[PDB]
Design a protein around this ligand. Structure first.
Ligand SMILES: Cc1cc2nc3c(=O)[nH]c(=O)nc-3n(C[C@H](O)[C@H](O)[C@H](O)COP(=O)(O)OP(=O)(O)OC[C@H]3O[C@@H](n4cnc5c(N)ncnc54)[C@H](O)[C@@H]3O)c2cc1C
Ligand SMILES: CCCCCCCCCCCCO[C@@H]1O[C@H](CO)[C@@H](O[C@H]2O[C@H](CO)[C@@H](O)[C@H](O)[C@H]2O)[C@H](O)[C@H]1O
Ligand SMILES: Cc1cc2nc3c(=O)[nH]c(=O)nc-3n(C[C@H](O)[C@H](O)[C@H](O)CO)c2cc1C
Ligand code: FES
Ligand code: FES
Ligand SMILES: [Ca+2]
Lengths: 387, 198, 204, 251, 408, 446
């Protein structure tokens, strides 16, 4: 219990040397502020998962077929037992229940396994357990589909934490994104539970495409919700009434949560603006050249923003301080490369419906080169005695 | 111009000589501690590959192609020895030309030339060329692009390894193990261009 | 005697310590059959090349030494290739480029330069055999792990029944891809340098 | 005068090594050719339904039961040539004996079609009971090659097999699954109006349908490739006129 | 059979074309002119040799040999060459031994510099007179339990000019050795037989080279004096090959001769009015005796001096009468000893215990300024480390501590 | 006018009132042996031996000729030595008024003096130790000459004094010191000041430059960066304004000037103000009956870069012109890291304290948080006006890398220049110590 008592209490220490007064900020407050910022997205994601599942279930089955389906899945009969209802007229509470029955087991598994690995490493190397794993665990739990198996979540958090982060030294001593590295482990290794048509609506027997997969097949006319029967307007993808990953769907809630940590100085408005610039430039160029066979060549810049996991990655995952560039001039190039590669993998890569994590991994590989270019340009000034 | 740009971009990004094809991983993983040395070695590799691939294309199409010399003869079993001989001889002659005629460029990039006298990347480039039956211009462009991709990859690895002066690596993983894991993560990142059929 | 044979397996390993030899190790370890054939070919070629360079170690002209050594190595590799395409046609189709890349493999040339030029014939055959033994230790371990966890088979024989043919196992996809070999060799180096701390590299 | 020594040594070494190399490479040439051919022979035997094992039995049964022939894709009439040695891929590559396809004709993204194709007439006795048509089209990660066995009537299918697919082992490489391949036995290529009618149904095919087979699950981008392969090769630029001649009579 | 002939002809002709183009590019694109190396820039003698080769090899061919233990490869790093113009690039293999200072003085390591062009370097003036000698063994009596004193006599009665603390390279041909050859007096043959060291044996079949430090100040003439320790195999791993050169020097008796080469060294005292403290033990008594005797008899110095020795028992210490005479003739000199495990027979009335503890407790503890003195140190590694740590804790600078490491 | 835009003006309670009032009587002085960089002393005094004013107390081994002289006359009562016999202080009971006197000149001929004569007089009197050299912040050799001397006529430290208040008291001594410095320097003299008016020297050699902005600007490092960039080849000296007044009084009267005007201020000082004192005065005797009851920390210098004055180091430094007293905080808080900070200062905007402008904070000596690895959210760039990449240089200092830090600009920095980067670090690093480590290694590998 004393090990957790390090979290509840301040350390109660004094300074030893030159700077006798210290700033009020620490790493704990930064990590908990980034952890609290994704709560609106988490809650709307649970709500949307429940609502999409209920809609798809009521579209397929009716009457006596519904009962045999809700008595077959523990999510459904546990909602019915706790108090909700799986009928077509369920309120906002019966949908958040069904979304929590999907999200909370994944979050629990991810947290437990990642914390086990982190405590193991910190014990073996005689350190203190660190925050900043809260962020990794919540982001990994929020960037996966609702129908992911728990053993795959365990394997993925193990890979993301041990290999990408803990092997290199811990928090602040790695060069890559742990959450995206774990998610990339599960996408290339077991790629049928994280792709296709049957993994994004947690309904039993429902096959339905997303929206960056309906756009690639037939354009903006092909954006129709089969479960309900109506078109996916722009305000649907912006607000978030679209199927997809758990906590990515609501661009409005992501903006509401990211404006705070951008105001506070924790996230980088330079990287965010760079991502936006790269996306707008490349999407406008594609719209200018245009194509006949490829329907993604005409997706505007404001459709790229609300579809897929672009906003989530731009706000919370592309602003990682350790993986990004350490120079103000390099952060712009980092963001521009992220946006450019995202749009490129979206449009001209046929096998992946999006590339918002492959882009970030590429930019993680190439950020130290931008820092090197800028610092080598800075050294030439100092040799000329003007800096 | 539409067909030669495609080959350049493909050889640079879609099929990277180092991270996609795994050619030259010994010097890649050994000589990549400093961005300076990695840049020099990448430039040397670019030059040698660009000079080597088209000459082997000429020799193949002139002598070693089936039925090229006389009708009914096939000398394709001399491919390996002819390629390795041409590569080694070109590397040595380039070393001597740089050492005598141009001392500055020799002190710049010739220092790395004894390493890539017989490297797997250049032999694999020539082998892929004889497999894909490129013309002379296609061979020039493919060699240039492959060298540029190899240089980009090794410079990125050197930049990462220089950023990792702040890390705290376990003792058993210090050096070679962590370099292997780093190159693995770099390949995981470079897997972005998998589906692009350019 | 025997210790000169078995030193490269653990004490001075090619892929683990003398970085020479990573290219084919990253590639031909998807299947244990190809890993075994590559092991045998590398052992044979290294041993024979060391033997011949030792036989003619005195009369090699220093000016064109590389040409005179590459002649022998490339002739041995060419003969090996022409024998593989006749009697093992399936393995060569999966080994296509790395059969010819044995010439530029670094083990074969490093053992010919550092050892064969300054040693007798009989010890040079033994040096080649030992370095091939270490090479094959690495290849076989990585290939066992990759083919077991990535396809559920060992040497083509079903072990863990895949879910596609009425089984309980769902194979990994990374064990058939690029990064997995890097991670496996890195963790193998970690395990090796845990038991033998004399190989641990210095902080500087 | 040190040049004499290096010249003599290099010449002796080159003579020995080159004699060995040229004696080895030329001796095993026919063995290599046989080993190359037997793979395709065994694949065709498997597609045709004949059971064989071992090189000797494979060769014997192939020379017994299978008779390759050439066909002109334009008119569907047999052409004279050595079908056992025809190389259709190099033929399609070469510009003299291949035609280029326009983007509206190139349904399967092959971009080049050879003039003369090869077909393997299965026969027991003098009568021919089957025909094996090689078809191919682009998938998502590579070009996929096939062997479709069409019966004598020219409509029914007796089996399919992809020997060269190269797609992800568990999403779209399920074209090599025995269940999916057995789904093909009994389907009818053409409808009553002599038009292509093979359909890859996304979501599973109606139980007992004659024209439709199930798609791959998680792979609609390599089920599209299969459907386009069959649409093109059963069309006017493929085995259309040949299958028409087969249906009319005189196989 | 037709293809075999074409294969043979084409292989031969391709190999000929490649070899001949390499020879043509090598003959024309390499000058291969003769270079003249200015041994010393101003003296007119110079070495004319083909450009191919190495600097140390050309110097050894011309007779000038540096005190290197490498023979190629830069193992230890004793060689020091100062070039003004020559080998331009400073190699990373020597950058380990050279700091930022000599990089501005222009020095390099000899094994790393390759002769490719005319160079002019400034060898140290003292290197000219390093003439090697071969001298007869006079006496080889055992002066300690594991240490034996060796003496050789120079022809012409010219004791080679060398400062106190230098060392010679002594080298020998192949030989077969057993511990039944040399004489061992009973006092130490006691423990010798107690641990039956005669079970050991060795056989060297190649020439060998080792270095040893002289125990005679310059004024003593005609004789070369040194103390050599036997390299008895460590009890941890006994079956290993025993000390080859040590066992050979031990097997040596009167009448035979060996080669003594080079009056060079590095462990020479600095000359100020700073108090000296000589900390030596084990086999390292020889350079300490050299230093003390030089400073006392040759220079007639009056600076306050001290000598602290270490030994396991009384039978191991020596030159006692000489040091008593020195301390009696000069009052400024005062020396002490310390025994780890003294014996009952000796009736010891002296300090006992580790020498660092003894020195610190007795002498420097009450000292008004322990950092003013300068300390000379030579002996076993444990003694070295212990006294180094004691002096550092006391606060003595690293500048004052001149350390000589036997085999390190 | 050079305007510094990136910096931080710490709001801390207890700003002094710029009125000079006499100080409490001091009976002990000292020379702190551990503030002189790279010094190893040779003592010329014994405990219980009477001394004079400007009498040598010890000398340098690494810098032959530099003499450290006594501030006042009396008796040496303590020579404190810490761990490894390192010198801590030489305490002198104040008694008598005897002194060593030197040659005195007129106001006219101060500029026409000999450089070597000025050098020897300063060395003998002990004022040579008022100079420091960038790089390495060491006392200049008695043989070397510099082409740029930086006089610091401004003070922007937290709770610092007003240089104009002092210089308006002895304009004559300031002008005399500036003339002496213009006679001593080979190239030039740079008097760095704020917009307010100061006395001016009539020499074409002395140039006045005006700086403006928050406080990285009062430090001589910013002045050197913006007016005369230093490196291994170009070395510049730095002296403050009170030491220039001392130099002027020395060359005008013939007797060392040891009086100082320091600012005693802090959150726990009952009445902050400027108080007169003597060089090296005892802080515990200076600040008794003047602090609030409880547990406090007495600092010699500012809160950014000072010395904790406890025991043997409880005396005024040679380069410190203020005393700072503030309470020590050691309370463990329930969720104090998660409380919205109405009374918490940060350069980040994650607390509510930034919403209230013009607020002052009663700051304790607590380190808010615990030691953790560096996560660069961008706080170092907000407080570094120099032309460097802060995060990369600080990581090069952390990683123990000397060559890269020197390439990135370590040779321009002092421990005072990284005090704000230490201040605003989330990982609670201390970069002055790492900078001194790298600079020591660079001094050695020379
Ligand atoms: C500058 C200098 C000055 C010196 N001055 C003196 C001097 O004045 N007096 C003096 O007595 N010595 C002196 N020495 C030491 C001496 O020259 C040698 O260090 C050594 O004692 C004799 O050389 P050697 O041929 O026996 O070495 P080696 O034969 O290489 O070493 C002999 C010892 O090493 C052990 N050994 C070697 N290899 C192994 C192994 N693999 N495993 C286990 N044990 C092993 C042997 O068991 C034996 O005990 C000096 C050394 C140097 C460098
Ligand atoms: C708040 C963050 C920053 C905001 C920044 C705003 C920058 C906006 C950049 C505008 C660039 C051009 O603006 C964009 O032009 C493209 C192509 O020209 C238009 O595109 C339109 O025409 C093209 C061409 O027929 C069609 O393929 C496309 O489907 C259609 O939308 C977009 O509708 C418009 O959004
Ligand atoms: C704005 C901000 C964004 C972060 N984003 C991520 C992320 O996307 N994935 C992750 O694993 N950790 C993230 N972290 C936590 C931390 O940066 C991460 O552990 C570092 O990459 C070092 O491991 C973030 C931290 C902050 C302050
Ligand atoms: S295999 Fe050794 S370098 Fe490519
Ligand atoms: S001894 Fe190794 S270099 Fe001279
Ligand atoms: Ca292709």
């Amino acid at each position: 219990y004393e090990a957790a008592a390090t979290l509840f209490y301040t350390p109660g220490l004094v300074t030893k040397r030159s700077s006798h007064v210290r700033d009020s900020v620490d790493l704990k407050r930064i990590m908990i502020m980034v952890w609290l910022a994704v709560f609106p997205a988490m809650f709307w994601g649970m709500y949307n998962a429940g609502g999409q599942a209920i809609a798809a279930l009521n579209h397929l089955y009716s009457g006596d077929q519904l009962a045999a389906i809700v008595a077959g899945n523990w999510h459904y009969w546990l909602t019915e037992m706790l108090g909700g209802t799986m009928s077509s007229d369920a309120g906002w509470g019966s949908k958040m229940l069904l979304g929590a029955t999907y999200f909370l087991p994944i979050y629990a598994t991810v947290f437990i396994v990642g914390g086990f690995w982190e405590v193991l490493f910190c014990m073996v190397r005689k350190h203190e357990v660190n925050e900043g794993f809260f962020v990794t665990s919540i982001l990994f739990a929020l960037i996966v589909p609702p129908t992911l198996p728990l053993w795959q979540a365990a394997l993925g958090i193990t890979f993301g934490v041990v290999v990408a982060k803990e092997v290199f030294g811990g928090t602040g001593r790695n060069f890559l994104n742990p959450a995206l590295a774990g998610r990339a482990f599960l996408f290339f290794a077991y790629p049928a539970q994280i792709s296709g048509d049957l993994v994004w609506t947690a309904a039993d027997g429902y096959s339905g495409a997303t929206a960056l997969s309906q756009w690639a097949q037939g354009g903006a006319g092909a954006l129709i919700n089969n479960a309900t029967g109506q078109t996916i307007t722009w305000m649907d993808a912006f607000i978030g009434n679209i199927p997809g990953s758990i906590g990515e769907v609501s661009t409005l809630a992501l903006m509401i949560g990211a404006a705070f940590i951008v105001y506070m100085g924790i996230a980088s408005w330079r990287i965010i603006g760079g991502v936006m610039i790269g996306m707008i430039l490349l999407s406008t160029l594609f719209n200018v050249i245009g194509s006949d066979t490829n329907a993604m060549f005409n997706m505007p810049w404001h459709w790229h923003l609300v579809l897929g996991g672009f906003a989530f990655g731009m706000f919370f995952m592309a602003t990682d301080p350790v993986s990004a560039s350490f120079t103000n001039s390099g952060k712009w190039a980092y963001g521009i490369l992220i946006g450019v590669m995202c749009v490129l993998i979206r449009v001209v890569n046929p096998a992946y419906p999006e590339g918002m994590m492959l882009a970030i991994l590429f930019a993680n590989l190439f950020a130290p080169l931008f820092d090197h270019v800028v610092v080598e340009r800075n050294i030439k000034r100092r040799l000329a005695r003007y800096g | 111009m539409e067909h030669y740009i495609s080959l350049l971009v493909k050889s640079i990004f879609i099929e990277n000589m180092a991270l996609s094809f795994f050619l030259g991983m010994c010097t890649f993983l050994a000589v990549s501690k400093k961005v300076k040395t990695s840049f020099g070695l990448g430039i040397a590799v670019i030059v040698v590959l660009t000079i080597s691939v088209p000459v082997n294309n000429l020799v193949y199409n002139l002598v070693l192609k089936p039925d090229a010399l006389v009708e009914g003869v096939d000398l394709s079993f001399l491919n390996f020895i002819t390629f390795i001989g041409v590569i080694a001889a070109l590397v040595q002659i380039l070393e001597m030309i740089l050492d005598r005629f141009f001392p500055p460029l020799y002190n710049a990039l010739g220092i790395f030339l004894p390493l890539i006298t017989v490297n797997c990347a250049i032999f694999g480039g020539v082998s892929f060329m004889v497999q894909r039956d490129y013309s002379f211009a296609e061979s020039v462009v493919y060699g240039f692009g492959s060298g540029v991709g190899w240089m980009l990859a090794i410079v990125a690895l050197a930049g990462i390894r220089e950023k990792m002066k702040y890390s705290d690596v376990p003792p058993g993983l210090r050096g070679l193990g962590i370099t292997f894991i780093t190159a693995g993560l770099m390949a995981l990142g470079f897997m972005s261009f998998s589906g692009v059929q350019l | 005697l025997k210790k000169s044979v078995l030193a490269p397996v653990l004490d001075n390993n090619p892929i683990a310590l003398q970085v020479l030899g990573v290219c084919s190790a990253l590639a031909v370890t998807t299947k244990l059959e190809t890993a075994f054939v590559m092991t045998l070919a590398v052992m044979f070629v290294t041993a024979l090349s060391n033997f011949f360079v030792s036989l003619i170690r005195n009369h090699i002209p220093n000016s064109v030494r590389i040409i005179v050594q590459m002649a022998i190595i490339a002739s041995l590799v060419i003969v090996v290739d022409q024998i593989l395409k006749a009697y093992l046609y399936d393995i060569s189709k999966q080994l296509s480029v790395f059969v010819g890349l044995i010439i530029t493999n670094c083990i074969v040339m490093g053992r010919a330069e550092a050892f064969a030029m300054k040693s007798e014939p009989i010890p040079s055959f033994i040096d080649g055999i030992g370095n091939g033994l270490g090479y094959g230790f690495v290849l076989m371990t990585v290939g066992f792990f990759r083919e077991l966890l990535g396809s559920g088979k060992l040497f083509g024989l079903e072990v863990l029944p895949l879910i596609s043919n009425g089984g309980w196992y769902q194979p990994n996809g990374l064990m058939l891809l690029a990064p997995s070999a890097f991670f496996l060799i890195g963790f193998m180096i970690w395990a090796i340098r845990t038991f033998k701390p004399e190989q641990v590299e210095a902080k500087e | 005068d040190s040049i004499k020594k290096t010249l003599f040594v290099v010449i002796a070494l080159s003579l020995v090594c080159s004699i060995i190399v040229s004696a080895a490479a030329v001796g095993l040439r026919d063995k290599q050719k046989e080993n190359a051919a037997l793979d395709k022979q065994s694949k065709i035997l498997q597609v045709a339904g004949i059971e064989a094992k071992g090189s000797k039995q494979i060769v014997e049964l192939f020379n017994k039961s299978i008779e390759p022939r050439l066909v002109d894709f334009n008119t569907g009439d047999f052409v004279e040539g050595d079908a056992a040695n025809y190389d259709q891929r190099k033929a399609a590559k070469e510009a003299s004996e291949s035609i280029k396809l326009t983007a509206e004709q190139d349904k399967a993204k092959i971009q080049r079609r050879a003039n003369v194709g090869v077909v393997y007439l299965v026969k027991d006795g003098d009568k021919t009971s089957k025909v094996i048509l090689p078809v191919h089209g682009n998938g998502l990660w590579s070009m996929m090659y096939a062997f479709v066995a069409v019966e004598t009537d020219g409509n029914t299918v007796s089996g399919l097999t992809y020997y060269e697919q190269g797609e992800t082992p568990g999403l779209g490489g399920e074209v090599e699954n025995p269940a999916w391949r057995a789904q093909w036995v009994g389907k009818k290529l053409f409808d009553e109006n002599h038009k292509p009618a093979i359909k890859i149904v996304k979501g599973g095919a109606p139980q007992g349908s004659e024209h439709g087979v199930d798609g791959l699950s998680g792979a609609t981008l390599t089920s599209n490739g299969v459907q386009n392969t069959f649409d093109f090769w059963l069309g006017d630029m493929g085995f259309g006129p040949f299958l028409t001649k087969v249906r009319d009579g005189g196989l | 059979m037709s293809t075999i002939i074409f294969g043979v002809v084409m292989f031969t002709l391709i190999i000929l074309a490649l070899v001949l183009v390499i020879l043509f590019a090598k003959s024309k694109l390499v000058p291969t002119g003769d270079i003249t190396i200015s041994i010393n820039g101003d003296p007119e003698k110079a070495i004319v040799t083909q450009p191919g080769g190495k600097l140390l090899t050309a110097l050894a061919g011309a007779g000038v040999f540096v005190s290197s233990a490498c023979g190629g490869g830069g193992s230890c790093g004793q060689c020091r060459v100062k070039i003004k113009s020559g080998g331009g690039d400073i190699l990373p293999t020597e950058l380990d031994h050279i700091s930022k200072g000599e990089a501005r003085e222009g020095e390099r390591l000899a094994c790393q510099v390759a002769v490719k062009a005319d160079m002019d370097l400034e060898l140290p003036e003292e290197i000219f007179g390093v003439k090697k000698w071969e001298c007869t063994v006079i006496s080889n009596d055992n002066k300690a339990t594991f240490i034996k004193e060796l003496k050789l006599a120079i022809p012409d009665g010219e004791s080679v000019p060398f400062r106190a603390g230098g060392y010679i390279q002594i080298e020998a041909p192949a030989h077969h050795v057993k511990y039944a050859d040399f004489d061992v007096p009973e006092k130490y043959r006691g423990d010798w037989d107690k641990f039956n060291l005669f079970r050991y044996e060795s056989k060297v079949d190649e020439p060998i080279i080792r270095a040893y430090s002289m125990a005679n100040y310059p004024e003593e003439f005609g004789i070369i004096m040194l103390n050599v320790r036997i390299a008895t195999p460590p009890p941890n791993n006994p079956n290993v090959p025993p000390g080859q050169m040590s066992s050979y020097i031990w097997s040596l008796k009167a009448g035979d001769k060996c080669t003594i080469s080079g009056p060079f060294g590095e462990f020479f005292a600095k000359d100020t009015d700073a108090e000296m403290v000589f900390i030596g033990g084990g086999a390292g008594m020889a350079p300490m005796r050299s230093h003390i005797f030089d400073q006392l008899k040759r220079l007639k110095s009056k600076r306050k001096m001290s000598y602290w020795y270490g030994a396991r028992s009384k039978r191991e210490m020596f030159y006692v009468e000489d040091f008593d005479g020195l301390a009696a003739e000069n009052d400024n000199f005062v020396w002490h000893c310390a025994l780890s495990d003294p014996q009952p027979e000796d009736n010891w009335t002296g300090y006992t215990g580790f020498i660092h503890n003894v020195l610190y407790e007795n002498y420097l503890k009450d000292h008004e300024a322990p950092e003013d003195c300068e300390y000379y140190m030579c002996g076993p590694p444990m003694m070295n480390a212990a006294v180094i740590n004691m002096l550092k804790n006391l606060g003595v600078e690293e500048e004052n501590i001149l350390l000589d490491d036997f085999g390190g | 006018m050079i305007t510094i835009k990136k910096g931080l003006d710490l709001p801390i309670a207890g700003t002094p009132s710029q009125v000079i009032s006499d100080g409490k009587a001091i009976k002990k002085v000292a020379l702190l042996g551990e503030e002189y960089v790279g010094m190893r002393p040779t003592m010329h005094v014994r405990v219980g031996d009477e001394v004079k004013k400007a009498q040598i107390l010890f000398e340098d081994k690494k810098n032959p000729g530099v003499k450290f002289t006594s501030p006042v006359s009396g008796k040496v009562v303590e020579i404190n030595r810490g761990a490894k016999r390192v010198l801590q202080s030489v305490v002198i009971e104040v008694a008598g008024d005897d002194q060593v006197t030197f040659d005195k000149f007129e106001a006219n001929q101060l500029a026409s003096l000999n450089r070597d004569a000025i050098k020897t007089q300063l060395v003998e009197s002990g004022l040579w130790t008022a100079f420091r050299t960038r790089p390495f912040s060491k006392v200049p050799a008695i043989d070397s000459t510099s082409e740029a001397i930086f006089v610091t006529a401004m003070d922007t430290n937290p709770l610092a004094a007003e240089p104009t208040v002092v210089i308006n008291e002895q304009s004559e001594a300031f002008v005399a010191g500036l003339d002496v410095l213009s006679a001593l320097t080979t190239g030039k003299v740079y008097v760095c000041k704020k917009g307010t008016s100061l006395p001016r020297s009539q020499q074409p050699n002395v140039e006045e430059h005006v700086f403006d902005g928050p406080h990285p600007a009062g430090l001589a490092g910013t002045h050197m960066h913006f007016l005369y960039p230093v490196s291994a080849d170009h070395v510049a000296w730095s002296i403050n304004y009170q030491d220039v007044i001392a130099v002027g009084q020395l060359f005008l009267t013939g007797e060392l000037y040891t009086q100082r005007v320091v600012s005693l201020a802090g959150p726990v000082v009952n009445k902050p103000r400027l108080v007169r004192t003597v060089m090296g005065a005892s802080l515990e005797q200076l600040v008794d009956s003047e602090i609030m009851p409880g547990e406090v920390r007495i600092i010699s210098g500012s809160v950014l870069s000072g010395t904790k004055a406890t025991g043997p180091h409880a005396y005024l430094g040679r380069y410190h012109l203020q005393v700072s007293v503030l309470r020590e905080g050691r309370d463990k808080e329930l969720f104090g890291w998660a409380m919205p900070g109405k009374n918490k200062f940060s350069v980040t905007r994650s607390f509510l304290g930034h919403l209230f402008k013009g607020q002052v904070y009663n700051m304790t000596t607590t380190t808010n948080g615990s030691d953790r690895s560096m996560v660069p959210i961008g706080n170092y760039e907000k407080v570094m006006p120099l032309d460097m990449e802060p995060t990369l240089l600080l990581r090069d200092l952390c990683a123990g890398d000397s060559d890269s830090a020197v390439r990135l600009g370590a040779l321009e920095l002092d421990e005072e220049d990284l005090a704000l980067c230490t201040f605003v670090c989330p990982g609670k690093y201390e970069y002055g110590q790492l900078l001194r480590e790298c600079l020591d290694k660079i001094e050695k590998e020379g």
